[PDB]
Design a protein around this ligand. Structure first.
Ligand code: HEC
Ligand SMILES: [Cl-]
Length: 161
């Protein structure tokens, strides 16, 4: 890893975050009843873009949450749990990077805004397709200001070129 690369990671992640926020922005939170707008793609393109960034840069990039919708986003390592804990214990902590044998790891917290409650709010108010597409879903019951999860990036110690 080099200076430009570290900065590129911060920027890429922040752009991914602003992208999600942008897609969700058209939706209200206080709406109880079902609406067609909830069939809008909001978070799937975030995951797709994450894969694209990972592949284009030779990084690992992944969303991680204790309460996840997609099983690919579960915590996997002691570091995942440690990072989520750091975010949980310091609400002002937005992001951090850590180095170890595996390489350089950047984590950036994801918080819950009102719009998000359209699909991650009340369990009983989740849009139809969610439950059958995600049978083991846990990404509900959030309130505005909750810790949603985090982005996790690794710049591996050993590259390919
Ligand atoms: C319905 C249109 C949703 C809106 C509004 C929000 N989210 Fe979402 N989220 C939704 C789906 C269908 C998924 C799974 C996508 C996939 O990769 O298969 C998600 C997932 C996330 C994740 C990834 C971690 C996980 O639980 O799998 C995060 C971090 C996340 N959602 C956060 C999030 C935020 C902050 C939102 C408000 C800006 C938000 N989501 C809105 C459906 C919908
Ligand atoms: Cl989505």
């Amino acid at each position: 890893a080099n200076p430009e690369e570290l900065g590129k990671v911060v920027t890429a992640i922040e752009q991914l975050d602003q992208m999600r926020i942008g897609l969700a922005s058209t939706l209200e939170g206080g709406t109880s009843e079902p609406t067609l707008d909830t069939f809008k793609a909001v978070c799937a393109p975030v995951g797709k873009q994450a894969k694209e960034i990972a592949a284009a840069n030779g990084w690992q990039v992944r969303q991680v949450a204790l309460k996840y919708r997609n099983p690919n986003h579960a915590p996997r390592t002691a570091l995942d749990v440690q990072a989520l804990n750091q975010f949980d214990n310091n609400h002002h902590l937005q992001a951090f990077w850590q180095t170890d044998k595996e390489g350089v790891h950047y984590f950036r917290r994801i918080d819950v805004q009102a719009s998000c409650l359209a699909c991650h709010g009340a369990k009983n108010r989740r849009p139809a397709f969610i439950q059958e597409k995600y049978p083991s879903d846990r990404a509900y019951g959030f309130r505005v200001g909750d810790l949603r999860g985090m982005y996790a990036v690794t710049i591996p110690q050993i590259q390919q070129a």
